[PDB]
Design a protein around this nucleic acid. Structure first.
Ligand SMILES: [Ca+2]
Length: 312
DNA sequence: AGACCTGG
DNA sequence: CAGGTCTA
């Protein structure tokens, strides 16, 4: 009872709730959908992972988001810890309002949205997001999830152990910039991605002014943030957009890839106007990005996440 | 337009 | 072959 991952039923006194309807958030649609790769459904409807440097288990009912944190001396989450959860799901951004706006300017969105409510954007830490997505090229969610997990066990601080699962905080820049990190990462199967992780860690710390340079990009504009991220090795337009959208508060960022094309072509009969090439390319991808921004508005990135989930 | 790294 | 990135 006092051991293993908790459940709302097994340790009722250790859970605290945050008012939140399923219409504003659906854990099963957000946590394993390629935004964050650190969440696991260790027990049906119960999701565990690291948030604000601690381990949490989350589960929801129709009107509540039940949270539980593991630190010593067991205890229900404090009002301040709960705010960290609220900020992580950016609960201040009302989904009902967004769905309504996107649904009123886009018939197709309104159709698919009906069955997929609760899809919103997580507000992730810049470092975790940068290196997690550096590992995203040529990999599916499952592979990415594995690489990120071994990377954290290897270079991340040990937090606590639940059952046979030991949680680790995400690796720091210092750790990732360490010597022989690349060789070590290759043994963990990160392949050529190992080099970018090592190279980007050292580049930020030794050429850009460190952690401050990254975090500070949140106060910077989307165009400026995107441009800056792109100098880092292993980070291109795609990864830069994912980072801007997921960690730098740039909701208008749309990460274009082949999947997005499939949707643009099938559900909007979209095709390139500016660039010559009629297939995916830097110039055409830039258009697709502008197309959806023009269609959905300031939160075009959030809107696509919805379609991205409806397409499973 | 290839090369870079591996399981499904 | 997979959500891409880098380079000729
Ligand atoms: Ca780059």
């Amino acid at each position: 009872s006092e051991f293993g991952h908790r459940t709302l039923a097994s340790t009722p006194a250790l859970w605290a709730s945050i008012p939140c309807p399923r219409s504003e958030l659906r854990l099963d649609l957000v946590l394993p959908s390629g935004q964050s790769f650190r969440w696991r459904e260790q027990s049906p409807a119960h999701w565990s992972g690291v948030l604000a440097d601690q381990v949490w288990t989350l589960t929801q009912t129709e009107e509540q988001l039940h949270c539980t944190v593991y630190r010593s001396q067991a205890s229900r989450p404090t009002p301040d810890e709960l705010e960290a959860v609220r900020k992580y799901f950016q609960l201040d951004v009302t989904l009902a309002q967004l769905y309504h706006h996107w649904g009123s300017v886009d018939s197709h969105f309104q159709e698919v949205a009906q069955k997929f409510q609760g899809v919103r954007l997580l507000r992730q830490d810049p470092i975790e997001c940068l290196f997690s997505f550096i590992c995203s090229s040529c990999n599916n969610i499952a592979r990415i999830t594995g690489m990120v997990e071994r990377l954290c066990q290897a270079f991340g601080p040990r937090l606590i152990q639940l059952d046979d699962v030991t949680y680790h905080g995400f690796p720091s820049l210092q750790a990732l910039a360490g010597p022989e990190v690349e060789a070590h990462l290759r043994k963990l199967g990160l392949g050529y991605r190992a080099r970018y992780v090592s190279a980007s860690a050292r580049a930020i710390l030794e050429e850009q002014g460190g952690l401050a340079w990254l975090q500070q990009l949140r106060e910077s504009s989307y165009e400026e943030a995107h441009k800056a991220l792109c100098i880092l090795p292993g980070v291109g337009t795609k990864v830069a957009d994912c980072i801007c959208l997921m960690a730098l508060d740039k909701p208008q960022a749309v990460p274009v890839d082949v999947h997005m094309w499939h949707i643009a072509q099938r559900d909007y009969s979209w095709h390139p106007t500016t660039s010559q090439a009629k297939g995916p390319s830097p110039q055409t991808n830039k258009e697709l990005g502008n197309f959806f921004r023009s269609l959905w508005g300031p939160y075009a990135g959030w809107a696509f996440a919805v379609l991205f989930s409806a397409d499973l």
